[PDB]
Amino acid sequence: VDSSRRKWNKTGHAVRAIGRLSSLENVYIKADKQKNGIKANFKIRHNIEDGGVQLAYHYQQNTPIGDGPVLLPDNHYLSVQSKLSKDPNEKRDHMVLLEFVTAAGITLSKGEELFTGVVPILVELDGDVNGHKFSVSGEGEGDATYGKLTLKFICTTGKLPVPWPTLVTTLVQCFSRYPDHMKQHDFFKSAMPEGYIQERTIFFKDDGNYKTRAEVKFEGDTLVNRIELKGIDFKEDGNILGHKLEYNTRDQLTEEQIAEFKEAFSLFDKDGDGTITTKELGTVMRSLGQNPTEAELQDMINEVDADGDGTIDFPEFLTMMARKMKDTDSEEEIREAFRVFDKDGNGYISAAELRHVMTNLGEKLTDEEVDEMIREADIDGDGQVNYEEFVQMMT
Amino acid sequence: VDSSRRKWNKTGHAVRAIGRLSSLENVYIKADKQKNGIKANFKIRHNIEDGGVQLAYHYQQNTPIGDGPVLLPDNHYLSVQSKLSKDPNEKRDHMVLLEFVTAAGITLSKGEELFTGVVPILVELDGDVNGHKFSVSGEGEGDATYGKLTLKFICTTGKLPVPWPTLVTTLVQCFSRYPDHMKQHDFFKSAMPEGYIQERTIFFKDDGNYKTRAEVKFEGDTLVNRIELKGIDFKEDGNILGHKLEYNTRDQLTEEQIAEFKEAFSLFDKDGDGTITTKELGTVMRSLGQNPTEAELQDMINEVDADGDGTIDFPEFLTMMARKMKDTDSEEEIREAFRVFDKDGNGYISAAELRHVMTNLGEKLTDEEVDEMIREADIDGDGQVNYEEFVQMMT
Ligand SMILES: [Ca+2]
Ligand SMILES: [Ca+2]
Ligand SMILES: [Ca+2]
Ligand SMILES: [Ca+2]
Ligand SMILES: [Ca+2]
Ligand SMILES: [Ca+2]
Ligand SMILES: [Ca+2]
Ligand SMILES: [Ca+2]
């Protein structure tokens, strides 16, 4: 490569480095004290079909509905993982949405109490974009312990006149997971049950804007998000009215695979508080016969610890487990997993070894259920699981 | 999938999660006050040819050679990236080694002054493993500003009787990069120029052990590491004497590609202190026409900030740039990079736009050199770079 190409590479690397650094779409929150609430600013990148991105610049204000005291936070952010899919049995225009949201950015009430378990959610939106009126209704549930939202939305007026992904931020941030050390900065939950008003302007670069106002509050045991949206100045053949935005990707974990990981997570998180501490991680590792030091345990957690709280929460765990792996590395991971099961290292996992491994993990199973696991894997019928049989179960 | 397979998946995920969490091989350091030095503990995982891992449990003590005062640290660790390769022109049994080492684990002198620039290194080792005597000599240089070591080792007695990778930890931790907030915890540099004694026991699981003693000190301007190694109890057909350990991998960045990234890094790190601050990152981004907020800049850096010092150092930058990317994501990254160069967005990068982009990055080039870059990319000879021509330069 000549000196010219060397200069392209060098300068290309620098420009691509900025791209990678700034690929974040986090929700930046600050206090708006004179309105007794908060403001937020963030940038959504909507993938355009067949390449490119449509920027959506979000400006947000929240103010409490009630008169009682709320918590006004220091600067921090929310980080969001979204998965959009379709219900194969649904003929109406619709969106199935799975979302994990966590707070971070700050280093180590009666409202919070309303979010300790699973909470039913209702969403109603009436919209008007360039004169095109439409409504959406949504239902599902939130589980703030895991920063989790699962909802299904239906366009109740027929065909949605804008792309589903453009409505996602508009369609309940009280379901975000705030770590313990940030509980004093959780405005959203502190305003409950009376609720808050959420207002946004969303500017679509080189296109129109949405203006939204929403009431977010409890009606009985249900968290309700009632929204009005007004969109103006949109181009008839732009990305929005022209439906040129990508709905989702195939490279996303199934909602079912995510559930499997949540199950696995629970084996570590034995008190169900939504975290794995060094204590909990060490307990499982010691049960399996390993002996990590306290420094190692702290280090292992720190490595995947996005919010810096010193523990692994479920979205952090999911991020680690969704990490895409080289086939050679995948093979080594499975090979090493086999050794954990195969306690005496003779190359066969016996029914007894499997029973003990289940017990070590805190997986409660009858001996019969363990024999059924053996049966599932046992190709040659010797009543035990060899390496190749185990490989099939990890594949 | 039946309930049995569901249980395999769940339990498999948990065991594989432990594997991923504990894949770290960091060097855990603590003070050894009664010896006026330090101790370290860590575990090296040597890949075995065709699968599996050979564990090497390391125990380490360091004590100062001189009588003057040294710095005794709080608990922390070193994180190491190693690349082993071969010199195609070298017929002697040899190892070319490239290493980046950084300190971390603690949250936000005349010895340190000896390491601000590039320092020549000499390494001499006399070894005796199971009666097999051998020597190794090494030479190269260390650049602690980047946590960088580059050395070439030769077996001066003929054929090395053990695998090269087993000698790596034995063959100068004063070259590790300690962030500013941890400078008081850098024992290694503080003992210079007089040096320190480094002793280890290295236990190879199911095999023999090495016992090493080394003198690490300045002789004139050269940092010298003089070592004696004794290995006993090794199995003639084990991984070590039987040479069954993997030397390296093909999935590693070239030493030349790494140099390209170091060049790109310098465009951000304009004061050459080995970090990129928010100030420096923002300065480059603003020059290119972008306007990240202070919260965004802090967030972008925090995302890749392994040592928590609030800045990007070179090994952190390399980790981000060595991140392996989906072809669809790679394509989008290049597409977005094109837009940065193509200032007016007309789909052609003109000579003027390229000149400005170079200036914006702080890349000093004559206009002639910029025309030569154009010429390199310019397939259709219109004197400008279109998207497809630019793609070729990023590929
Ligand atoms: Ca827990
Ligand atoms: Ca955490
Ligand atoms: Ca066994
Ligand atoms: Ca079998
Ligand atoms: Ca700098
Ligand atoms: Ca850093
Ligand atoms: Ca142009
Ligand atoms: Ca051209």
From Swiss-Prot, chains A, B:
Changing residue 209 to T: In EBFP1.2; shifts the excitation and emission spectra to shorter wavelengths and increases quantum yields compared to BFP. Changing residue 99 to G: Suppresses the 399 nm excitation peak, leaving only the longer wavelength peak at 475 nm. SUPFAM superfamilies: GFP-like (SSF54511). InterPro entries: GFP, GFP-related, Green_fluorescent_prot. Keywords: Chromophore, Luminescence, Photoprotein. The keyword Cell membrane does not apply. Changing residue 172 to L: In EYFP; leads to yellow fluorescence, folds faster and more efficiently at 37 degrees Celsius and has superior solubility and brightness. Contains a chromophore consisting of modified amino acid residues. Maturation of the chromophore requires nothing other than molecular oxygen. Changing residue 172 to N: In R10-3; matures to the red-emitting state with excitation and emission maxima at 555 and 585 nm, respectively. Photocytes. Changing residue 75 to I: In mut2.1; shifts fluorescence lifetime from 3.03 to 2.50 ns. Green fluorescent protein has been engineered to produce a vast number of variously colored mutants, fusion proteins, and biosensors. Further generation of mutants led to more stable proteins (at 37 degrees Celsius for example) with brighter fluorescence and longer fluorescence lifetimes. Changing residue 26 to K: Increases fluorescence at warmer temperatures such as 37 degrees Celsius. In Esmerald; leads to brighter fluorescence. In VisGreen; leads to brighter fluorescence. Changing residue 101 to R: In Azurite; shifts the excitation and emission spectra to shorter wavelengths and increases quantum yields compared to BFP. GO terms for biological process: bioluminescence; generation of precursor metabolites and energy. Coiled coil: none annotated. Changing residue 39 to Q: In R10-3; matures to the red-emitting state with excitation and emission maxima at 555 and 585 nm, respectively. Energy-transfer acceptor. Its role is to transduce the blue chemiluminescence of the protein aequorin into green fluorescent light by energy transfer. Fluoresces in vivo upon receiving energy from the Ca(2+)-activated photoprotein aequorin. Monomer. This is Green fluorescent protein. The lineage of its organism: Eukaryota, Metazoa, Cnidaria, Hydrozoa, Hydroidolina.
